Subunit: 253 residues, 4 copies
């Protein structure tokens, strides 16, 4: 019965960057679907912990800098120690730096690439090793962007990193699908989170964007709950290496 395929009871999901915004939404969604949650954040995600534990699920809160690739194994080991296994990885921890491309600093390049693509590859590798050890497959959900498809402006390292995310998602699937590992990505559209706060404070810019969203509204963290559960579940077993836009029709227009 197909509805059972979406049920994540007994599963363990590790989500990086789930104190706020989109990551918090995905953590709560996965928990509502039955997952126990391992968070990796720079600060204790108090609100997310409250919401997850209110569902009767467990939350293991790890505090770490995801850009430090030497630390990833330890994060996964803690998760495996508590729950016995890790089944789902959501590589949501990311940053953005805005600066004219002609002036763009090496720091704004390195900081963004280090987190948005390098740490994503290496955390995926770390968790995939654990999936292979367990022998029961696994799910990796990367977070792409509209700037995986379009160039944008003033964010060269962001566009580079997010375009790279879409590419490496393909390669990871190619190599690991044979182990029952599904590596896919979600490309959120224009979502009303802290990352579009400047844009939305400008009435004229805000309307310019909104009028180009067919759905006629901004995305919210809630909009990623269903897509993330879907991609984390057996309901999407023959989807692999693919980026799904959750954009209210942005790319369609």
């Amino acid at each position: 019965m197909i509805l059972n395929s979406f049920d994540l009871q007994g599963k363990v999901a590790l989500i990086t960057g789930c104190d706020t915004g989109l990551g918090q939404g995905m953590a709560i969604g996965l928990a509502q679907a039955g997952c126990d949650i391992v968070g990796v954040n720079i600060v204790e995600p108090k609100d997310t912990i409250e919401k997850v534990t209110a569902l009767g699920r467990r939350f293991l809160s790890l505090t770490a800098d995801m850009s430090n690739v030497s630390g990833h194994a330890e994060l996964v080991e803690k998760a495996v120690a508590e729950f016995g296994h890790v089944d789902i990885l959501v590589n949501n921890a990311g940053i953005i730096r805005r600066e004219d491309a002609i002036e763009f600093s090496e720091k704004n390049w390195d900081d963004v690439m280090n987190l948005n693509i390098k740490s994503v590859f290496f955390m995926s590798q770390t968790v995939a090793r654990q999936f292979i050890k367990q022998g029961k497959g696994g799910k990796i959900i990367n977070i792409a962007s509209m700037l995986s498809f379009q160039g944008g402006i003033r964010v060269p390292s962001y566009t580079a990193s997010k375009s790279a995310v879409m590419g490496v998602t393909r390669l990871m699937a190619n190599e690991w699908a044979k182990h029952g590992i599904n590596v896919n990505a979600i490309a959120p559209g224009y979502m009303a989170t802290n990352n579009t706060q400047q844009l939305r404070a400008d009435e004229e810019r805000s309307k310019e964007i909104l009028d180009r969203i067919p759905a006629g509204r901004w995305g919210l963290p809630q909009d990623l709950m269903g897509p993330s559960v879907f991609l984390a579940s057996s309901a999407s077993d023959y989807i692999n290496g693919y980026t799904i836009a959750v954009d209210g029709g942005w790319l369609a227009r």
Copy 2:
């Protein structure tokens, strides 16, 4: 609670081409999720009806040639009369004609285009009118192909029609998303149905294709149940105009 967002109880899904293979799978999946089913087929979908009614769901079987666009309004009227509303359309009715491109007949062009793209647009229009009347949104799921992305050989009208499907899915979303109508597409990979019967019976070709599917297996009708329920449900509300490959990694490789 997100699992409720996948639940299609109380919904009515109209699926064209559901006597066999992929269409049969999607109809059964939708029924398993709670949908009553309206079928449109050239012949009685006897097995599909048995399976749907075994779930305790209703099945209205309409017999018609989907290529006859003047007949669509009546099909939808009959669906609406029987159930009170139609909530989901799956445009699966399709054919393929194989012939060297240099020799390709006008018949093998027209027959494929009339069904695979023309009737898809006009049936979508017909149902969209009903969605707008009802005022509770709606879902359209078109069926794309790997040949929406790649050219293939000996099937010009199929490649044309399925590439067109991907495009027109975008435009339908652009115009109708404001009414809470989601128009998306599923692009199946190489699936174990009658359409690949000759390919799968040739062990050389078969192995050559399988070796380029990361999943290392053919797709099955059951692999479309989850994705179709997802795209027919509230769990995908902010996905619009988009084509999701269900291909075992084919496009990623």
Copy 3:
């Protein structure tokens, strides 16, 4: 010496719809590169004839409705009787019909599809047969659109046809590369022609679109001269089945 590769001395190019706008530009550019031209038009291309003749090149002006696929063989026969051979085809003849998708008529569907995709496939076939008879390969250049990539609004049959063009270009290359035939496409951006007459008049819409073209200007027929000569020449021999956007950065933004 690489500049010799762009030289089309002694070539014969058949361009459909070259009385004005983009088709006129491409015909003139092909003529400047050394081509004699065969035009196929609904109205006599008087201006194009003058400009091609002024270069010292020959222009055979054929008059026909390109949607009539039964007439294609004759058109190529006429070209071969006059010039002895055909080396290059540009499938530029096309139309657009604007009407709300929910209201879209069968007429506005059929008229656009018959010309923009059906006649393109069948003319390509007809010329390909001639290329094969001659035994020295050939070039086909189809005309895609930004609406091969994006959905747009109020033009379902145009989006369908132009998306189909991009796809069928791939299949033609796959099947006919073995006959030494290159089949590629040009996707013009927003070009200043009769098509964008409404848009460019509307001052508010015009500014809104121009501000989203990185080049900051509308495209011109002149902008397709270089690209069409490139794709018609030996300088692009290892490009096949591919669509090249000539769009001032539209898709990049």
Copy 4:
């Protein structure tokens, strides 16, 4: 007269990595079209220098590690001193590291990303600054890959970097089009160079890839001469932010 638009007489082109294979091919093609050449290489490009000077063009041979981004400014300063201006940049310097994704080392990540994407961005930035100082626009040609579109296997940092190249090409076009700068990319297919030596030695794998190239042949450095001249010339002025596959139909199949 359109053939004059391909002529690069009086132009200066800086090509990184042009001692062998594809980079050599593009340097020679640009020189054949009229360009004086500035090379940046690890080793002295003896054969390339001989071939460029034999055409009667100048070759300034600079020796540097392109990954050292602090060194870029001086490289461009020397080019500007020696020729008075730089008009064209080809970012060809790159590497590849093959290792199973599950074992992939940090070194094999960093070395590839540092050269293939980081240095490409910063060298582009460095030259763009000079294009702006000069006030006469400029051309940048980046080198993408089939692995900008597909995932491949055992080369996660290569796929990441080349996917990033395709993305950042879009952003560079968006931001720098206002300075009269075109930024585009060439995606070579499977080319017979050092980089495909092993593949082409193994006759089983060699044939099966060859069978999936519609052209029926490996690409060669000479295949990039025409497309690079085209993208370096006024003939491609309304092309910006776009990637052109030179792949014998690989992506089409």
